[PDB]
Amino acid sequence: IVGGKVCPKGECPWQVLLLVNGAQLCGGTLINTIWVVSAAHCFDKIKNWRNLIAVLGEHDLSEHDGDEQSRRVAQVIIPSTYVPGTTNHDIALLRLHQPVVLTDHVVPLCLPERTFSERTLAFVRFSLVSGWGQLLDRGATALELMVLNVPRLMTQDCLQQSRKDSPNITEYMFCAGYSDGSKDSCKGDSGGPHATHYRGTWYLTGIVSWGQGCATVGHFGVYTRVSQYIEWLQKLMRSEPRPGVLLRAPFP
Amino acid sequence: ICVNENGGCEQYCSDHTGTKRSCRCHEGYSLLADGVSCTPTVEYPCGKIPILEKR
């Protein structure tokens, strides 16, 4: 996260840290006690599927304070339409091997209904994006969880306000952020939440997905449009686990 | 009705046959008698920040 601030400990309680062989991989969002929403591109280079861990209640990477809860990722569900190395349908649904325990420091973010998200949440201008990604383009990643308030743009406006072989902004994406190079989410924030506040409650509206460098002038951050996947997610959360970590599920 | 100001609902809105509207809530919440407000039914409802709520 570039140009944000430290998220005060416990104020981002749905933030997930994904680890592979103990190394920082991506962010994610807890949506109930056993399910995590992340980005499909986070898993393009994974070979050690059995060494994937989700950490809830994390804040400071340098210290163990007792609020952290680690779980093995039992399943990674990706839409059939996602193509590795590309941008479209950038979403993954992760089943934890054992549920996390809800506490003051571990709380799910609401996964909204599609209608509510399209009709109402899509028009809330500002939303928060968070993660332990790069503090600067070509810079070090954060030791403390960072958060940034970003405004959402209509895709016509994102296409007109952008500068520059760049991918298209599909109906499964939306732009958010700034074109002046001061504030953005970065590659190390991939998979993390874009959370929207409405009438005293926070909801999942986007996933940190892609962009150019980090906080690059003339470029906005691009986020997976979660509203397109509500039905796809709900159906999978009602399904029985299958042998093997990676599962490709038909989309729609 | 639901398209305009979320039909007055705090959370979810369903349109019915006519000028009828039903508000609904996410799991871990129940609808109040005003037919629009959602109140938590659990200790850790989704999308609420305990350290801020307890303040």
Ligand SMILES: CN1Cc2cc(ccc2S(=O)(=O)C2CC2)NC(=O)OCCc2cccc(c2)[C@@H](Nc2ccc3c(N)nccc3c2)C1=O
């Ligand atoms: C460069 N990378 C890394 C990687 C890429 C791929 C596949 C795997 C890995 S990875 O294995 O490192 C895995 C993170 C763990 N695929 C692509 O590059 O495909 C297109 C998506 C794509 C295009 C361009 C960049 C990124 C992804 C980038 N993420 C982001 C995310 C949000 C941004 C934002 N708001 N502003 C500016 C830039 C941003 C860059 C990123 O994740």
Ligand SMILES: [Ca+2]
């Ligand atoms: Ca810690």
